[PDB]
Amino acid sequence: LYHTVPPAVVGVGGGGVNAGPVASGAIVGTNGYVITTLHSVSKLPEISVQVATTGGIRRFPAQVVKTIPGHDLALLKMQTTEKFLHFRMADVQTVVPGQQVFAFGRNMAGAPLVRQGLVQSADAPLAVGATQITHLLRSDAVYSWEQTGGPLVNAQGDLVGINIAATGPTGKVEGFTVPAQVIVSHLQD
């Protein structure tokens, strides 16, 4: 699993040469579609997506194609003629409390992050700035802010959702997750 999922896990950040990922994202289409969290890229002047290859990190400029503000998601398209391995939206599955899930990300250096955990809730609300997002998943697989925007998968490696790391009142990290059907159903082309 830790072999076949990471290639579709990207880093996302600004366009500076010396800039690295500020969040993660998931490649969801051959021609360079990335889903990531909206609050991570909306204030960025330029967006660059960082992709792992056998020869090291490759960077591609990206633009926003569609925003899903109600669920803090953004859909990017990389500007490239290259083709990518991706999550197959057909294979998108749901999860239930108790189920085991895996949250992937890339750090500020482009290295892969994975953490395992259980689904603790399948209906939690979250406040990202002014938006009240509802019906979120909740899981302890999300321990780090660098995991925000990256994918949650099940044990078979199907895309299950997109992760949001949030702040507790005590400052403890709590894992949240936008269910992956929010992707298919707020999308068309």
Numbering used by the authors: 34 to 222
From the paper:
Here, we characterize a protein called MamO that helps to initiate the formation of a magnetic mineral called magnetite in cells of the magnetotactic bacterium Magentospirillum magneticum AMB-1. Although predicted to be a trypsin-like protease, we show that MamO has lost its ancestral catalytic activity and instead gained a new function as a metal-binding scaffold. Two genes in the MAI, mamE and mamO, are homologous to the HtrA proteases, a ubiquitous family of trypsin-like enzymes that functions using His-Asp-Ser catalytic triads. It appears to have lost the ability to perform serine protease activity and instead performs two noncatalytic functions: direct metal binding to promote magnetite nucleation and activation of MamE’s proteolytic activity.
To explore this possibility further, we determined the crystal structure of the protease domain. It crystallizes as a monomer with the chymotrypsin fold and the catalytic residues properly placed. Loop L1 of MamO adopts the inactive conformation seen in many HtrA proteases in which the main chain carbonyl of residue 192 (chymotrypsin numbering; W222 in MamO) prevents access to the oxyanion hole. Although glycine is highly conserved at position 193 in the trypsin family and is critical for catalysis, MamO contains a glutamate (E223) at this position. Therefore, the active configuration of MamO would contain a strong steric clash between the E223 side chain and the main chain carbonyl of W222. The active configuration is strongly disfavored unless glycine occupies position 193, indicating that the E223 side-chain in MamO likely prevents the formation of an oxyanion hole. While refining the MamO structure, we observed a peptide bound near the predicted peptide-binding groove. We suspect its source is the flexible N-terminal region from a neighboring MamO in the crystal that is not built into the model. However, the bulky side-chain of W222 in MamO seems to block the exit path between loops LA and LD, forcing the peptide away from the catalytic center. Overall, the structural features of the L1 loop appear incompatible with protease activity: E223 provides an energetic barrier to catalysis while W222 serves as a physical barrier to productive substrate binding.
